[PDB]
RNA sequence: GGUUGAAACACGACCUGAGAAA
């Protein structure tokens, strides 16, 4: 039975200057052979704390680790705009080494309403036999949002895919794209193509729509 | 400067073999423990294997024991990860990490490489079809317009999208790839620009899918209506 | 076992200990 590292919470949204605490509980004794890492999206992890409580060279002193038996905590005293990433704990007391599931720290900002855009499929794509209708939600917060596709007032389900960006580095907002995919035979049997968007930053759902060939 | 450079990744069939390399510079691997740590797309780090500096002792995660073999060539200052009997579960970005010096960093991994992407699938490579997301507004609407490109039906990851040959970087949003039901990836890359820029500014999306050796530049223009 | 030697095991040294402890 190898060692487990239960990291909690899996994610948290905090503001600049906040005091955040990430905890890791080892399923058995790992002494103090626990390390903490910081990983930016698309980049390699960076060593922050080694030996449970020792600060790695070059890491600012706002990061700190502590041990309480089998409980290990990573603490950022005052959150900085560059401290927002995913943090991992790792035990190296015995092989196999194991990492915690990670904790993504995102910046909490004020609520922002999404700017909604609808795009009809280009003339080139129906020549290929497939139609993709894209609905864009640009620069909103928080990330949670409801995107519904309605064609001739008929609700769609199971034929659209959603994709959300990471939190933007400038305005700390999210962007969402919903792509309704239909065949040319199914695309031309309908007229109205509407994208309904519901978000807490909006007083009511916003609807961007178009018709086939309506300019 | 102390650095680790992974290589040897790519697309491989399930059950096939792949040998990853980790070229080290600025230090000698013979005095350090070298570890392999992978990260499946959108998940956390998972320790894979390690090799001890002076004894050559090797250790492996339970999910890779017997299939994987880690080794080091001190004369080449390079570590290796021989991967055999590859499964779809092995699809991940593979990092090689130097375990720091004991007195200076305990057992923490003080240096990581950029990582190499390993994709285990029987799916064939396929270049993407790029379709334009034409802006609806006009050059004189007085607002901000939104345009983009639809990078559809490609395999495997990754694909890169730039606008106006990297000259346009403000307001661009390149969404993460989503795996469609057909098994091919698809994503959109959009950008918000002033409506007054239409006509004075041209907008070219540059799509580069290196695994399939496809480079496509699609011109996104206001639709002729 | 601990500490260390660029060093989790193996190896060298040191420490504890009847013994580094199969």
Short mmCIF file of C-alpha atoms (C1' of nucleotides) in Angstrom, two decimals:
data_model
loop_
_atom_site.label_atom_id
_atom_site.label_comp_id
_atom_site.label_asym_id
_atom_site.label_seq_id
_atom_site.Cartn_x
_atom_site.Cartn_y
_atom_site.Cartn_z
CA UNK A 1 0.00 0.00 0.00
CA UNK A 2 1.68 3.17 -1.25
CA UNK A 3 1.18 6.64 0.21
CA UNK A 4 -1.71 8.89 -0.80
CA UNK A 5 -1.69 12.69 -0.71
CA UNK A 6 -5.18 14.18 -0.32
CA UNK A 7 -5.02 17.84 -1.38
CA UNK A 8 -7.83 20.21 -0.43
CA UNK A 9 -9.47 22.25 -1.79
CA UNK A 10 -9.35 21.28 -5.48
CA UNK A 11 -9.74 24.96 -6.38
CA UNK A 12 -10.39 28.34 -4.79
CA UNK A 13 -11.01 31.89 -6.01
CA UNK A 14 -9.29 34.60 -3.97
CA UNK A 15 -8.45 38.28 -4.35
CA UNK A 16 -5.07 39.99 -4.35
CA UNK A 17 -3.76 40.30 -0.81
CA UNK A 18 -5.84 37.42 0.56
CA UNK A 19 -4.37 34.79 2.86
CA UNK A 20 -4.87 31.37 1.24
CA UNK A 21 -4.06 28.00 2.79
CA UNK A 22 -3.71 24.73 0.85
CA UNK A 23 -3.59 21.51 2.86
CA UNK A 24 -2.32 18.01 2.10
CA UNK A 25 -2.92 14.97 4.33
CA UNK A 26 -0.68 11.94 3.88
CA UNK A 27 -2.39 8.58 4.31
CA UNK A 28 0.55 7.47 6.47
CA UNK A 29 3.82 8.75 7.90
CA UNK A 30 5.98 10.62 5.38
CA UNK A 31 8.17 12.39 8.00
CA UNK A 32 8.84 15.90 6.58
CA UNK A 33 9.74 14.79 3.03
CA UNK A 34 6.98 16.90 1.48
CA UNK A 35 7.47 19.43 -1.31
CA UNK A 36 5.15 22.06 -2.78
CA UNK A 37 5.16 23.14 -6.43
CA UNK A 38 3.65 25.96 -8.49
CA UNK A 39 2.67 25.37 -12.12
CA UNK A 40 1.47 28.03 -14.55
CA UNK A 41 -0.80 26.84 -17.39
CA UNK A 42 1.29 25.48 -20.23
CA UNK A 43 4.51 25.77 -18.19
CA UNK A 44 6.61 23.45 -16.05
CA UNK A 45 6.15 23.27 -12.26
CA UNK A 46 8.45 25.32 -10.03
CA UNK A 47 9.75 24.30 -6.62
CA UNK A 48 8.41 26.45 -3.77
CA UNK A 49 8.82 24.54 -0.49
CA UNK A 50 10.99 21.53 0.28
CA UNK A 51 11.21 19.43 3.45
CA UNK A 52 7.65 20.45 4.43
CA UNK A 53 8.66 23.87 5.77
CA UNK A 54 11.89 25.02 4.08
CA UNK A 55 11.71 27.80 1.49
CA UNK A 56 13.48 27.04 -1.79
CA UNK A 57 16.06 29.58 -2.92
CA UNK A 58 14.59 32.48 -4.88
CA UNK A 59 10.99 31.89 -3.78
CA UNK A 60 9.48 34.96 -2.06
CA UNK A 61 8.91 34.72 1.68
CA UNK A 62 5.13 35.02 1.33
CA UNK A 63 5.10 31.28 0.59
CA UNK A 64 5.44 29.04 3.63
CA UNK A 65 4.92 25.38 4.49
CA UNK A 66 4.21 23.69 7.80
CA UNK A 67 3.90 20.15 9.13
CA UNK A 68 1.46 18.86 11.77
CA UNK A 69 2.00 15.11 12.00
CA UNK A 70 0.70 13.90 8.64
CA UNK A 71 -0.97 17.25 7.83
CA UNK A 72 0.94 19.61 5.54
CA UNK A 73 -0.12 23.16 4.69
CA UNK A 74 0.97 25.61 1.99
CA UNK A 75 0.30 29.23 2.93
CA UNK A 76 0.51 32.40 0.85
CA UNK A 77 0.47 35.27 3.34
CA UNK A 78 -0.58 38.02 0.90
CA UNK A 79 -1.78 36.89 -2.51
CA UNK A 80 -0.01 38.53 -5.46
CA UNK A 81 -1.26 38.79 -9.07
CA UNK A 82 1.52 36.39 -10.15
CA UNK A 83 0.68 33.75 -7.51
CA UNK A 84 -2.41 32.53 -9.41
CA UNK A 85 -1.68 29.03 -10.74
CA UNK A 86 -2.11 25.38 -9.75
CA UNK A 87 -0.27 24.19 -6.64
CA UNK A 88 0.81 20.60 -6.00
CA UNK A 89 2.12 18.81 -2.92
CA UNK A 90 4.44 15.82 -3.21
CA UNK A 91 5.84 13.34 -0.71
CA UNK A 92 9.31 11.88 -1.28
CA UNK A 93 9.57 9.80 1.89
CA UNK A 94 9.41 6.48 0.02
CA UNK A 95 8.92 5.16 -3.49
CA UNK A 96 6.65 5.43 -5.39
CA UNK A 97 6.42 9.21 -4.99
CA UNK A 98 2.92 10.65 -5.22
CA UNK A 99 1.55 14.11 -5.93
CA UNK A 100 -1.60 15.70 -4.60
CA UNK A 101 -4.47 16.19 -7.00
CA UNK A 102 -3.61 19.89 -7.16
CA UNK A 103 -5.26 23.18 -6.24
CA UNK A 104 -5.98 25.79 -8.90
CA UNK A 105 -5.90 29.31 -7.44
CA UNK A 106 -7.82 31.80 -9.57
CA UNK A 107 -8.23 35.54 -9.06
CA UNK A 108 -11.62 36.66 -7.76
CA UNK A 109 -12.88 39.87 -9.38
CA UNK A 110 -16.14 41.75 -9.75
CA UNK A 111 -18.97 40.25 -11.79
CA UNK A 112 -18.74 41.04 -15.51
CA UNK A 113 -21.46 40.40 -18.07
CA UNK A 114 -20.58 38.50 -21.27
CA UNK A 115 -20.58 40.19 -24.66
CA UNK A 116 -22.44 37.71 -26.87
CA UNK A 117 -21.70 37.19 -30.57
CA UNK A 118 -23.21 34.79 -33.10
CA UNK A 119 -21.43 33.63 -36.26
CA UNK A 120 -23.17 31.91 -39.19
CA UNK A 121 -21.25 29.11 -40.92
CA UNK A 122 -19.14 30.32 -43.82
CA UNK A 123 -20.08 29.41 -47.39
CA UNK A 124 -17.01 27.15 -47.61
CA UNK A 125 -18.11 24.77 -44.85
CA UNK A 126 -21.53 23.76 -46.21
CA UNK A 127 -19.72 22.85 -49.44
CA UNK A 128 -17.95 20.27 -47.26
CA UNK A 129 -21.33 18.98 -46.03
CA UNK A 130 -21.14 20.17 -42.40
CA UNK A 131 -22.43 23.32 -40.70
CA UNK A 132 -20.91 24.73 -37.50
CA UNK A 133 -22.69 27.59 -35.73
CA UNK A 134 -20.45 29.31 -33.17
CA UNK A 135 -21.66 31.44 -30.25
CA UNK A 136 -19.07 33.58 -28.45
CA UNK A 137 -19.24 34.76 -24.83
CA UNK A 138 -16.43 37.29 -24.45
CA UNK A 139 -14.88 38.57 -21.21
CA UNK A 140 -17.23 37.59 -18.38
CA UNK A 141 -16.99 36.63 -14.71
CA UNK A 142 -17.69 34.29 -12.99
CA UNK A 143 -17.01 31.37 -15.33
CA UNK A 144 -20.39 29.67 -14.80
CA UNK A 145 -22.86 30.41 -17.58
CA UNK A 146 -25.82 28.85 -19.41
CA UNK A 147 -25.67 28.62 -23.21
CA UNK A 148 -28.71 27.21 -25.01
CA UNK A 149 -29.20 26.65 -28.74
CA UNK A 150 -32.69 27.18 -30.18
CA UNK A 151 -33.56 26.63 -33.85
CA UNK A 152 -37.08 27.72 -34.85
CA UNK A 153 -37.80 27.90 -31.09
CA UNK A 154 -36.80 24.22 -30.74
CA UNK A 155 -34.24 23.47 -28.03
CA UNK A 156 -31.10 21.58 -29.06
CA UNK A 157 -29.28 19.02 -26.94
CA UNK A 158 -26.38 16.65 -27.53
CA UNK A 159 -25.04 18.28 -30.71
CA UNK A 160 -23.09 21.25 -29.29
CA UNK A 161 -19.73 21.52 -27.53
CA UNK A 162 -18.50 24.13 -25.07
CA UNK A 163 -14.98 25.45 -24.51
CA UNK A 164 -13.82 27.99 -21.92
CA UNK A 165 -10.50 29.82 -21.78
CA UNK A 166 -8.26 30.13 -18.76
CA UNK A 167 -8.65 33.27 -16.69
CA UNK A 168 -7.30 36.19 -18.71
CA UNK A 169 -4.04 37.73 -17.52
CA UNK A 170 -5.29 41.32 -17.92
CA UNK A 171 -8.96 41.67 -16.91
CA UNK A 172 -9.21 38.28 -15.12
CA UNK A 173 -12.27 37.36 -17.19
CA UNK A 174 -13.30 34.16 -18.96
CA UNK A 175 -14.37 33.57 -22.55
CA UNK A 176 -16.67 30.79 -23.76
CA UNK A 177 -17.35 29.37 -27.22
CA UNK A 178 -20.32 27.11 -27.96
CA UNK A 179 -20.28 25.38 -31.35
CA UNK A 180 -23.48 23.83 -32.72
CA UNK A 181 -22.53 21.21 -35.31
CA UNK A 182 -25.07 20.03 -37.89
CA UNK A 183 -24.99 18.33 -41.26
CA UNK A 184 -25.87 20.31 -44.37
CA UNK A 185 -29.06 18.27 -44.75
CA UNK A 186 -30.05 19.08 -41.16
CA UNK A 187 -28.87 22.70 -41.37
CA UNK A 188 -31.05 23.59 -44.38
CA UNK A 189 -34.24 22.09 -42.89
CA UNK A 190 -34.41 25.00 -40.42
CA UNK A 191 -34.56 28.80 -40.59
CA UNK A 192 -33.87 30.62 -37.30
CA UNK A 193 -30.63 29.90 -35.43
CA UNK A 194 -30.58 31.52 -31.98
CA UNK A 195 -28.04 31.48 -29.15
CA UNK A 196 -29.55 32.14 -25.71
CA UNK A 197 -27.11 33.12 -22.96
CA UNK A 198 -27.89 33.30 -19.23
CA UNK A 199 -25.39 34.76 -16.78
CA UNK A 200 -25.66 36.23 -13.29
CA UNK A 201 -24.14 39.48 -14.59
CA UNK A 202 -27.18 39.82 -16.87
CA UNK A 203 -30.61 40.96 -15.70
CA UNK A 204 -32.22 38.57 -18.20
CA UNK A 205 -31.10 36.06 -20.86
CA UNK A 206 -29.59 37.62 -23.99
CA UNK A 207 -30.32 36.13 -27.41
CA UNK A 208 -28.19 36.52 -30.54
CA UNK A 209 -29.82 34.93 -33.59
CA UNK A 210 -29.65 34.75 -37.37
CA UNK A 211 -31.30 33.11 -40.38
CA UNK A 212 -29.76 31.13 -43.23
CA UNK A 213 -28.90 33.62 -45.95
CA UNK A 214 -30.06 36.69 -43.99
CA UNK A 215 -26.77 38.55 -44.62
CA UNK B 1 22.04 27.88 -17.05
CA UNK B 2 20.68 24.66 -15.57
CA UNK B 3 18.10 23.28 -17.99
CA UNK B 4 16.48 20.00 -19.02
CA UNK B 5 15.27 19.42 -22.58
CA UNK B 6 12.88 16.56 -23.29
CA UNK B 7 12.49 15.05 -26.75
CA UNK B 8 11.19 11.96 -28.51
CA UNK B 9 7.49 12.61 -27.94
CA UNK B 10 4.82 12.34 -30.59
CA UNK B 11 1.90 10.26 -31.78
CA UNK B 12 2.23 6.49 -31.30
CA UNK B 13 -0.08 3.51 -31.69
CA UNK B 14 -1.39 1.75 -28.56
CA UNK B 15 0.88 -1.16 -27.72
CA UNK B 16 3.81 0.50 -29.50
CA UNK B 17 7.11 1.72 -28.09
CA UNK B 18 8.63 5.16 -27.62
CA UNK B 19 11.97 6.27 -26.16
CA UNK B 20 12.04 9.69 -24.50
CA UNK B 21 15.29 11.61 -24.01
CA UNK B 22 16.20 14.25 -21.42
CA UNK B 23 19.29 16.26 -22.38
CA UNK B 24 20.75 18.15 -19.42
CA UNK B 25 22.88 21.29 -19.57
CA UNK B 26 24.56 23.39 -16.91
CA UNK B 27 25.03 20.36 -14.65
CA UNK B 28 26.02 16.69 -14.71
CA UNK B 29 23.26 14.13 -14.13
CA UNK B 30 25.71 11.70 -12.50
CA UNK B 31 25.50 13.66 -9.23
CA UNK B 32 21.69 13.94 -9.10
CA UNK B 33 18.60 11.78 -9.12
CA UNK B 34 16.59 12.17 -12.34
CA UNK B 35 12.82 11.70 -12.26
CA UNK B 36 10.14 11.40 -14.93
CA UNK B 37 6.80 13.05 -14.14
CA UNK B 38 3.87 13.09 -16.55
CA UNK B 39 0.67 15.12 -16.71
CA UNK B 40 -2.30 13.98 -18.76
CA UNK B 41 -4.10 16.83 -20.59
CA UNK B 42 -6.10 18.71 -17.96
CA UNK B 43 -5.04 16.60 -14.96
CA UNK B 44 -2.35 16.69 -12.27
CA UNK B 45 1.23 15.49 -12.10
CA UNK B 46 1.88 11.77 -11.73
CA UNK B 47 5.30 10.44 -10.79
CA UNK B 48 6.49 7.83 -13.27
CA UNK B 49 10.09 6.76 -12.67
CA UNK B 50 13.39 7.79 -11.11
CA UNK B 51 17.03 6.70 -11.16
CA UNK B 52 19.55 7.13 -8.35
CA UNK B 53 22.83 8.96 -9.05
CA UNK B 54 25.59 6.62 -7.87
CA UNK B 55 23.98 3.17 -7.63
CA UNK B 56 21.86 3.41 -10.77
CA UNK B 57 18.88 2.07 -8.81
CA UNK B 58 15.55 2.60 -10.56
CA UNK B 59 12.04 3.05 -9.19
CA UNK B 60 8.72 2.99 -11.02
CA UNK B 61 5.09 3.82 -10.41
CA UNK B 62 2.76 0.83 -10.17
CA UNK B 63 0.99 1.80 -13.40
CA UNK B 64 4.23 1.68 -15.44
CA UNK B 65 6.29 -1.04 -13.74
CA UNK B 66 7.58 -3.61 -16.23
CA UNK B 67 6.46 -1.56 -19.23
CA UNK B 68 8.74 1.45 -18.62
CA UNK B 69 12.51 1.53 -18.19
CA UNK B 70 14.40 4.61 -16.99
CA UNK B 71 18.15 4.91 -17.56
CA UNK B 72 20.92 7.50 -17.62
CA UNK B 73 23.96 7.92 -19.87
CA UNK B 74 26.45 10.02 -17.92
CA UNK B 75 28.77 10.22 -20.94
CA UNK B 76 25.90 11.84 -22.87
CA UNK B 77 24.57 13.74 -19.82
CA UNK B 78 21.14 12.47 -20.84
CA UNK B 79 18.42 10.45 -19.13
CA UNK B 80 15.99 8.18 -20.97
CA UNK B 81 12.50 6.77 -20.52
CA UNK B 82 11.90 3.65 -22.62
CA UNK B 83 8.12 3.26 -22.87
CA UNK B 84 6.67 -0.02 -24.12
CA UNK B 85 3.16 -1.51 -24.26
CA UNK B 86 1.80 2.02 -24.41
CA UNK B 87 -1.88 2.54 -23.56
CA UNK B 88 -4.21 5.50 -23.97
CA UNK B 89 -3.69 6.13 -20.24
CA UNK B 90 -0.05 6.97 -21.03
CA UNK B 91 -1.09 10.01 -23.11
CA UNK B 92 0.45 12.91 -21.19
CA UNK B 93 3.06 15.64 -21.22
CA UNK B 94 6.22 13.99 -19.90
CA UNK B 95 8.59 16.08 -17.79
CA UNK B 96 12.04 15.05 -16.63
CA UNK B 97 12.96 16.64 -13.31
CA UNK B 98 16.24 16.96 -11.45
CA UNK B 99 16.03 16.14 -7.77
CA UNK B 100 17.92 18.97 -6.11
CA UNK B 101 20.95 18.65 -3.89
CA UNK B 102 20.07 17.26 -0.47
CA UNK B 103 21.69 19.98 1.63
CA UNK B 104 20.25 22.77 -0.55
CA UNK B 105 16.73 21.53 -1.36
CA UNK B 106 16.14 18.19 0.39
CA UNK B 107 14.29 15.91 -2.03
CA UNK B 108 12.40 18.60 -3.94
CA UNK B 109 12.55 18.69 -7.74
CA UNK B 110 14.33 22.02 -8.24
CA UNK B 111 14.58 21.91 -12.05
CA UNK B 112 11.99 20.76 -14.59
CA UNK B 113 12.09 20.53 -18.36
CA UNK B 114 9.59 22.06 -20.74
CA UNK B 115 8.01 18.62 -21.18
CA UNK B 116 7.29 16.58 -24.29
CA UNK B 117 3.82 15.57 -25.48
CA UNK B 118 3.13 11.86 -25.94
CA UNK B 119 -0.17 10.93 -27.59
CA UNK B 120 -1.11 7.23 -27.68
CA UNK B 121 -3.92 6.65 -30.25
CA UNK B 122 -4.67 4.53 -33.32
CA UNK B 123 -6.24 7.63 -34.94
CA UNK B 124 -4.47 8.80 -38.09
CA UNK B 125 -2.94 12.24 -38.35
CA UNK B 126 -5.24 14.77 -40.01
CA UNK B 127 -4.73 18.41 -40.95
CA UNK B 128 -7.35 20.94 -39.91
CA UNK B 129 -9.85 22.70 -42.13
CA UNK B 130 -9.93 26.42 -41.32
CA UNK B 131 -13.20 28.31 -41.76
CA UNK B 132 -13.71 32.04 -41.10
CA UNK B 133 -15.98 33.47 -38.42
CA UNK B 134 -16.96 36.60 -40.33
CA UNK B 135 -17.80 39.68 -38.22
CA UNK B 136 -21.46 40.68 -38.30
CA UNK B 137 -21.04 44.40 -37.58
CA UNK B 138 -19.96 47.10 -40.05
CA UNK B 139 -16.92 49.34 -40.36
CA UNK B 140 -19.04 52.25 -39.04
CA UNK B 141 -21.12 50.59 -36.30
CA UNK B 142 -19.02 52.56 -33.79
CA UNK B 143 -18.62 49.54 -31.50
CA UNK B 144 -16.21 46.64 -31.13
CA UNK B 145 -16.38 43.83 -33.68
CA UNK B 146 -15.67 40.14 -33.14
CA UNK B 147 -14.15 37.86 -35.77
CA UNK B 148 -12.31 34.57 -35.72
CA UNK B 149 -11.32 31.32 -37.37
CA UNK B 150 -12.76 27.83 -36.90
CA UNK B 151 -9.96 25.23 -36.73
CA UNK B 152 -11.93 22.03 -37.30
CA UNK B 153 -11.24 18.30 -37.70
CA UNK B 154 -7.59 17.74 -36.88
CA UNK B 155 -5.58 15.16 -34.95
CA UNK B 156 -3.54 15.14 -32.79
CA UNK B 157 -2.95 18.07 -30.47
CA UNK B 158 -1.55 20.69 -30.54
CA UNK B 159 -2.41 23.38 -33.09
CA UNK B 160 -1.21 26.98 -32.98
CA UNK B 161 -3.22 30.01 -34.10
CA UNK B 162 -1.78 33.50 -34.53
CA UNK B 163 -3.36 36.61 -36.04
CA UNK B 164 -1.63 38.81 -38.63
CA UNK B 165 1.57 36.77 -38.16
CA UNK B 166 1.69 37.38 -34.41
CA UNK B 167 1.36 41.16 -34.83
CA UNK B 168 -2.18 41.09 -33.38
CA UNK B 169 -2.09 39.88 -29.77
CA UNK B 170 -4.48 42.18 -27.87
CA UNK B 171 -8.03 40.89 -27.49
CA UNK B 172 -7.31 37.47 -29.03
CA UNK B 173 -8.88 34.40 -27.43
CA UNK B 174 -7.78 30.96 -28.63
CA UNK B 175 -10.07 28.41 -27.02
CA UNK B 176 -8.82 25.00 -25.85
CA UNK B 177 -9.35 22.16 -28.29
CA UNK B 178 -12.45 20.04 -27.74
CA UNK B 179 -12.58 16.41 -28.85
CA UNK B 180 -15.59 15.87 -31.10
CA UNK B 181 -17.60 12.65 -31.32
CA UNK B 182 -15.75 11.80 -34.55
CA UNK B 183 -12.45 11.64 -32.63
CA UNK B 184 -11.01 14.79 -34.24
CA UNK B 185 -10.15 17.97 -32.38
CA UNK B 186 -11.70 21.37 -33.03
CA UNK B 187 -11.29 24.87 -31.63
CA UNK B 188 -12.07 28.50 -32.40
CA UNK B 189 -9.75 31.50 -32.13
CA UNK B 190 -11.53 34.85 -31.88
CA UNK B 191 -10.40 38.45 -31.45
CA UNK B 192 -12.21 41.69 -30.64
CA UNK B 193 -11.17 44.71 -32.71
CA UNK B 194 -12.58 48.22 -33.21
CA UNK B 195 -15.24 48.32 -35.91
CA UNK B 196 -13.44 51.37 -37.33
CA UNK B 197 -10.44 49.13 -38.09
CA UNK B 198 -12.34 47.23 -40.81
CA UNK B 199 -10.80 48.19 -44.15
CA UNK B 200 -7.77 49.93 -42.70
CA UNK B 201 -6.69 46.70 -40.96
CA UNK B 202 -6.51 43.25 -42.58
CA UNK B 203 -7.04 40.16 -40.40
CA UNK B 204 -5.23 36.91 -41.26
CA UNK B 205 -5.43 33.90 -38.95
CA UNK B 206 -2.32 31.71 -39.16
CA UNK B 207 -3.02 28.07 -38.30
CA UNK B 208 -0.04 25.73 -37.88
CA UNK B 209 -0.59 22.02 -37.16
CA UNK B 210 2.95 20.66 -37.08
CA UNK B 211 2.11 16.93 -36.58
CA UNK B 212 0.38 16.90 -39.99
CA UNK B 213 2.75 19.49 -41.55
CA UNK B 214 -0.17 21.79 -42.38
CA UNK B 215 0.13 25.59 -42.50
CA UNK B 216 -3.06 27.44 -43.46
CA UNK B 217 -3.65 31.20 -43.59
CA UNK B 218 -7.33 32.13 -43.91
CA UNK B 219 -8.48 35.69 -44.58
CA UNK B 220 -11.41 36.73 -42.38
CA UNK B 221 -13.30 39.55 -44.11
CA UNK B 222 -16.73 41.15 -43.63
CA UNK B 223 -19.26 38.98 -45.43
CA UNK B 224 -20.46 40.31 -48.79
CA UNK B 225 -24.03 41.07 -47.81
"C1'" G C 1 18.28 4.12 11.67
"C1'" G C 2 20.08 9.24 11.69
"C1'" U C 3 23.54 12.74 9.52
"C1'" U C 4 26.55 13.68 5.55
"C1'" G C 5 30.09 12.98 0.98
"C1'" A C 6 26.95 16.50 -5.64
"C1'" A C 7 24.68 10.30 -2.61
"C1'" A C 8 16.48 8.23 -0.08
"C1'" C C 9 18.86 2.29 -2.06
"C1'" A C 10 24.02 0.47 -2.89
"C1'" C C 11 29.07 2.62 -1.40
"C1'" G C 12 32.55 5.94 2.06
"C1'" A C 13 32.73 8.67 6.51
"C1'" C C 14 30.48 10.20 11.09
"C1'" C C 15 26.58 9.74 15.16
"C1'" U C 16 23.37 6.79 18.30
"C1'" G C 17 23.25 1.91 19.87
"C1'" A C 18 24.77 -4.81 22.42
"C1'" G C 19 24.48 -4.75 17.24
"C1'" A C 20 23.15 -0.20 11.72
"C1'" A C 21 20.02 -3.61 13.19
"C1'" A C 22 19.76 -9.91 8.08
#
